[PDB]
């Protein structure tokens, strides 16, 4: 006989919309926070997880829809945030640049597209060379040949405050707490949670800059190790501290460009010009690589491990792009990887202000300069590596090379969402019984 | 929230009180937490979906006569071609998840039979009884 | 929809008739069909919340085992720690507004007790 039951504890894999829950309060009013607080739900006081005795589930770090949802909120918010700000289109005119390492910083004479009176006026500004095309000594800004470059508004702070992702009622998030889970296959010790832990929305490439750590040892995860084209995500169990600076005392000036709107640039440099270097301890870096190579060798049995160098013609892919105080540092990592393993460190960087963030086209953000000098630091907690490929030597030479390369920001987000899966609750079900 | 590593028999012994927690969760509490086109339209859409799902389940319990019931027995016999197992394997060896997967292919048949009989043939019988 | 200042006894007498008007629909017949970009989104938010309120009241009453009824006698005893007043004075000196304010801080507790005691009915 058919008996109908309601409230049956059965779930199926599902994809849904998640809520943004902020971490306590960052409701600043001088400058509003954008990644957090902006249209976000108050913190749900720490609920407990529920372990489901003996429930095993199949988790998959790859093809994880939570990564895709994080991606879309980040891109959408970035654009929504920048949208209501001044266009720098009127600045896409010929520059006459004279300079002031040599011409790192370009001193350019500028003809203003007139903003008010429709009669010509002139001004000057300093630029980093990485924003200028040397197209007779005629210079132009790099992204004027693609789209509208907009200035980020001074009232908006892109500070990466951790965000908790929360399921809508009727949905739940399963979490894998099993030991040394490698991002794929069955997991025991599965619990149900209301929201994820907070994930700091850090945007980086070629090096992770902040995040969670491996519990006991370095854990190397990949969708497939055999296929060299897959990204190998390496999570460290110890933090290595990176110290980045821009020891250049900048005086900011404001140039009128439109009725109701101003452009911010650097007027002058006080004192000598210095390189924006980053510092990593020698000892910690070498010990970190030793551990990675050991675990990586277990995966790639009986071979010498080389890391070699980052390679490509595009700085967005080639160098890490640490975001320090709101300025973007493109750093040379050669000194970190050009070694092998068979049983301080200073990195030069450059500053770039016009960025087609997310390695897309059709838009760019202009980062106004920060007054004075800056310093920041962070915990690396992980690397992104790829394999060099095969050879006609048939690996008799070993030296398997794992290059310090990434280039797809969804891997950063994936690295902390490997523990979570979204499911939906289906309370109805039936079973044979012996009644009416 | 639940267990579900347990067998159908054991899990269901508390359905009377596990239910009415899952039900409650669908509408209550979260909507107090939320009293605060990136995180705009999406939340509105999420609210709408939750309502639509809720009503679907209530409508089916209603169409099948299980109005306000957590456990209800009806006049449709079990077809032994479905999960042709002993009653004990179904209730004491299998879990609810495993069970739902095994008969997932007969869901449409079961639901159609429940609608034809309960509150349908049954209500035409009641209209006849109330004619006097 | 008056007698707000009347006593609880007086106001609950024939609660049902008053209730039918209040409960003829939240919006009665979709604002009695009289009403049938930012303005649009604000109104959708208003309409969705009205729907949620309707359903929440019905769901909670259903959980408590009160369905198709407006007045339900439950399995939870009154705890004098919530209120210790003569039954007669709360019913014939106090109004419903005053009463609801008087025990406002016990709302979560009473409701939680009702869900547990009403759920534990064999079913």
């Amino acid at each position, epitope marked *: 006989w058919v008996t109908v039951y309601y409230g049956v504890p059965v779930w199926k894999e599902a994809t849904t919309t998640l809520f943004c829950a902020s971490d306590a309060k960052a409701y600043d009013t001088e400058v509003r926070n954008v990644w957090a607080t902006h249209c976000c739900v108050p913190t749900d006081p720490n609920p407990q997880e529920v372990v489901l005795e003996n429930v095993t589930e199949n988790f998959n770090m790859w093809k994880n829809d939570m990564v895709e949802q994080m991606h879309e909120d980040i891109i959408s918010l970035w654009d929504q945030s920048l949208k209501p700000c001044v266009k720098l289109t009127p600045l896409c005119v010929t520059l006459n640049c004279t300079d002031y390492e040599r011409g790192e910083i370009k001193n350019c004479s500028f003809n203003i597209t007139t903003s008010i009176r429709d009669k010509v006026q002139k001004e000057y500004a300093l630029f980093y060379k990485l924003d200028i095309v040397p197209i007779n000594n005629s210079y132009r800004l790099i992204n004027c040949n693609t789209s509208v470059i907009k200035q980020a508004c001074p009232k908006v702070s892109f500070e990466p405050i951790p965000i908790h992702y929360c399921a809508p009622a009727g949905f739940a998030i399963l979490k894998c707490n099993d030991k040394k889970f490698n991002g794929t296959g069955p997991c025991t010790n599965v619990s149900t949670v209301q929201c994820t832990h907070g994930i700091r929305p850090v945007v980086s490439t070629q090096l992770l800059l902040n995040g969670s750590l491996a519990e006991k040892e370095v854990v190397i995860r990949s969708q497939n190790f055999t296929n060299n084209a897959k990204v190998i995500i390496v999570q460290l169990n110890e933090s290595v501290v990176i110290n980045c600076t821009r020891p250049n005392n900048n005086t900011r000036k404001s140039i009128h460009i439109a009725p109701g709107r101003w452009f911010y640039t650097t007027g002058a440099i006080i004192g000598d010009i210095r390189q924006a270097h980053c510092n990593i301890s020698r000892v910690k870096w070498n010990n970190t690589l030793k551990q990675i190579a050991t675990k990586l060798r277990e995966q790639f049995k009986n071979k010498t491990i080389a890391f070699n160098q980052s390679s490509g013609g595009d700085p967005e892919i080639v160098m890490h792009s640490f975001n320090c105080g709101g300025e973007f540092f493109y750093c040379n990592t050669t000194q970190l990887f050009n070694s092998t393993w068979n049983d301080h460190i200073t990195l030069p960087c450059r500053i770039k202000q016009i960025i087609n963030m997310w390695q897309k086209v059709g838009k760019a953000m202009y980062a106004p300069p920060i007054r004075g000098q800056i310093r920041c630091s962070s915990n690396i907690t992980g690397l992104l590596l790829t394999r060099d490929g095969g050879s006609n030597e048939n690996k008799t030479s070993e030296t398997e090379t794992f290059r310090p390369a990434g280039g797809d920001m969804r891997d950063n987000w994936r690295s902390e969402l490997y523990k979570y899966k979204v499911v939906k609750i289906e309370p109805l079900g039936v079973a044979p019984t012996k*009644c009416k | 929230l639940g267990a579900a*590593g347990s067998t159908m028999g*054991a899990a269901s012994m508390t359905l009377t009180v596990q239910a009415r927690q899952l039900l409650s969760g669908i509408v209550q509490q979260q909507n107090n937490l939320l009293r605060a086109t990136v995180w705009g339209i999406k939340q509105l859409q999420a609210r709408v979906l939750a309502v639509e799902r809720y009503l679907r389940d209530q409508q089916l319990l209603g169409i099948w006569g299980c109005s306000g019931k957590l*456990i209800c027995c009806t006049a449709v016999p079990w077809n032994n071609s479905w999960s042709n197992r002993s009653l*004990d394997m179904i*209730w004491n060896n299998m879990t609810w998840i495993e069970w739902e997967r095994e008969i997932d292919n007969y869901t449409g048949l079961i639901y159609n039979l429940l609608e034809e009989s309960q509150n349908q043939q049954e209500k035409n019988e009641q209209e006849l009884l109330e004619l006097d | 929809l008056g007698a707000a200042g009347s006593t609880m006894g007086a106001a609950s007498m024939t609660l049902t008739v008053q209730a039918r008007q209040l409960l003829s629909g939240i919006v009665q017949q979709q604002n009695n069909l009289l009403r049938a970009t930012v303005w649009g989104i604000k109104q959708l938010q208003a309409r969705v919340l009205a729907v949620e309120r309707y359903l929440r009241d019905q769901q909670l009453l259903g959980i408590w085992g009160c369905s198709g009824k407006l007045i339900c006698c439950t399995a939870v005893p009154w705890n004098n720690s919530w209120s210790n007043r003569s039954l007669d004075m709360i019913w014939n000196n106090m109004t419903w507004i005053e009463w609801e304010r008087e025990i406002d801080n016990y709302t979560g507790l009473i409701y939680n007790l009702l869900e547990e005691s009403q759920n534990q009915q064999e079913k």
Partner: antibody, heavy 124, light 107 residues
Framework: QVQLQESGPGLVKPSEALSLTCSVS????????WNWIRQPPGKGLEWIGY???????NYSPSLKSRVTISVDTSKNEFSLTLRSVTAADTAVYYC??????????????????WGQGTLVTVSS | YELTQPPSVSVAPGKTARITCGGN??????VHWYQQKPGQAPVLVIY???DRPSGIPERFSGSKSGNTATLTISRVEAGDEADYYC???????????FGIGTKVTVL
């Protein structure tokens, strides 16, 4: 399918608590309800109580003022404690795995694999 | 809740034994049966109202009617001597109720 293994103190004094533990070498504790049943020499069976790992527990009224049950899912075992155990409580204490089918108002349960029981003697 | 059951019954070898119980609303509540050999834990003979589990001989069957319930053992063997018990679950109390056990002797 399931073999249960009893243990206990054997002889206890008339004012002492009795603590018995049964292990399960069959299935996980979390899959089924576990029950205790008493049988005094020369008598029929008396139910003591049931427990499930999620805290759902209940007892036979005759022992309620003196009895508690708990489980430990990490050792895949469960136990019974009866306080102030007297001469009248001499009995064989049995463990069994409970099976069930859920009907709207007449729940049916069975004790299907049984351990063989442990005899508890209570005397001065 | 309590069950009613006779203290004993005796039967000749080869005959059918009728082992019975009763009580209030026995029709509403399923009555299952156990067999206890001296010195052994009880073994389930009938589950639910009449279902024979594996390991129990085909000679064992059950039925429920009115305020009474019966265990039927056809062709009784000397090895069937045992105390046979009825059990019900009182859903309104979680009161697990056993009968006394009918002592069944095969002559």
């Amino acid at each position: 399918q399931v073999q249960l293994q009893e243990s206990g103190p054997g002889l206890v004094k008339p004012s002492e608590a009795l603590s018995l533990t049964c292990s399960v070498s069959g299935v996980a504790i979390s899959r089924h309800y576990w029950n205790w049943i008493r049988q005094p020499p020369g008598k029929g069976l008396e139910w003591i109580g049931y427990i499930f790992f999620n805290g759902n527990t209940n007892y036979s009224p005759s022992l309620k003022s003196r009895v508690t049950i708990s489980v430990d899912t990490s050792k895949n075992e469960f136990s019974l404690t009866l306080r102030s155990v007297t001469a009248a409580d001499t009995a064989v204490y049995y463990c069994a795995r409970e099976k069930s089918v859920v009907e709207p108002d007449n729940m049916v349960r069975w004790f299907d694999p049984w351990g063989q029981g442990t005899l508890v003697t209570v005397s001065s | 809740y309590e069950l009613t059951q006779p203290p004993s019954v005796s039967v000749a070898p080869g005959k059918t034994a009728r082992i019975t119980c009763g009580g209030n609303n026995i029709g509403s509540k399923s009555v299952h049966w156990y067999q206890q050999k001296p010195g052994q834990a009880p073994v389930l003979v009938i589950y639910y109202d009449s279902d024979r589990p594996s390991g129990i001989p085909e000679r064992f069957s059950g039925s429920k009617s009115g305020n009474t319930a019966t265990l039927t053992i056809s062709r009784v063997e000397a090895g069937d001597e045992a105390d046979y018990y009825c059990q019900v679950w009182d859903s309104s109390r979680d009161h697990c109720v056993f009968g006394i056990g009918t002592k069944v002797t095969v002559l």
